[PDB]
């Protein structure tokens, strides 16, 4: 008989870098609000 | 019995026996589990060890 002492099997486990991983970022455009005095289209009429 | 089973597989492999166990063959088993089990159950030459 032989003993597995020296030849024992190996388990594996990755060295995950999640602890130092950057996050996913969401973008939102800062709308030029119409609540603030934004301009409007100058629909014109004629006084005949 | 997972831990003792791993020790037993170590023992058998060291003694020269080609052992098939799910944890060590997880890839081919992952392809198709039932086919994998059948492959070893069909073969008469394969000897099956039951861990009680």
Swiss-Prot record, chain A:
Modifications made to the protein after synthesis: Glycosylated.
Tissue: Widely expressed.
Highest taxon in the source lineage: Eukaryota
Assembly notes: Forms heterodimers with IL17RC; the heterodimer binds IL17A and IL17F homodimers as well as the heterodimer formed by IL17A and IL17F. Forms complexes with 2:1 binding stoichiometry: two receptor chains for one interleukin molecule. IL17A homodimer preferentially drives the formation of IL17RA-IL17RC heterodimeric receptor complex, whereas IL17F homodimer forms predominantly complexes with IL17RC homodimer. (Microbial infection) Interacts with SARS coronavirus-2/SARS-CoV-2 virus protein ORF8.
Pathology linked to this chain's protein: Immunodeficiency 51: A primary immunodeficiency disorder with altered immune responses and impaired clearance of fungal infections, selective against Candida. It is characterized by persistent and/or recurrent infections of the skin, nails and mucous membranes caused by organisms of the genus Candida, mainly Candida albicans.
Function: Receptor for IL17A and IL17F, major effector cytokines of innate and adaptive immune system involved in antimicrobial host defense and maintenance of tissue integrity. Receptor for IL17A. Receptor for IL17F. Binds to IL17A with higher affinity than to IL17F. Binds IL17A and IL17F homodimers as part of a heterodimeric complex with IL17RC. Also binds heterodimers formed by IL17A and IL17F as part of a heterodimeric complex with IL17RC.
Protein's name according to its UniProt entry: Interleukin-17 receptor A
Organism, scientific name: Homo sapiens
Gene transcribed to yield this protein: IL17RA
Swiss-Prot record, chain B:
Domain of life, per lineage: Eukaryota
Cysteines joined through disulfide linkages: none
Expression sites by tissue: Widely expressed.
Quaternary structure and interacting proteins, as annotated: Interacts with IKBKG/NF-kappa B essential modulator, with CHUK/IKK-alpha and with IKBKB/IKK-beta. Interacts with TRAF6; this interaction is direct. Interacts with IL17RA and IL17RC. Interacts with IL17RB.
Clinical note on disease: Psoriasis 13: A common, chronic inflammatory disease of the skin with multifactorial etiology. It is characterized by red, scaly plaques usually found on the scalp, elbows and knees. These lesions are caused by abnormal keratinocyte proliferation and infiltration of inflammatory cells into the dermis and epidermis.
Free-text function comment from the UniProt entry: E3 ubiquitin ligase that catalyzes 'Lys-63'-linked polyubiquitination of target protein, enhancing protein-protein interaction and cell signaling. Transfers ubiquitin from E2 ubiquitin-conjugating enzyme UBE2V1-UBE2N to substrate protein. Essential adapter molecule in IL17A-mediated signaling. Upon IL17A stimulation, interacts with IL17RA and IL17RC receptor chains through SEFIR domains and catalyzes 'Lys-63'-linked polyubiquitination of TRAF6, leading to TRAF6-mediated activation of NF-kappa-B and MAPkinase pathways.
Protein name: E3 ubiquitin ligase TRAF3IP2
Species: Homo sapiens (Human)
Organism phylogeny: Eukaryota, Metazoa, Chordata, Craniata, Vertebrata
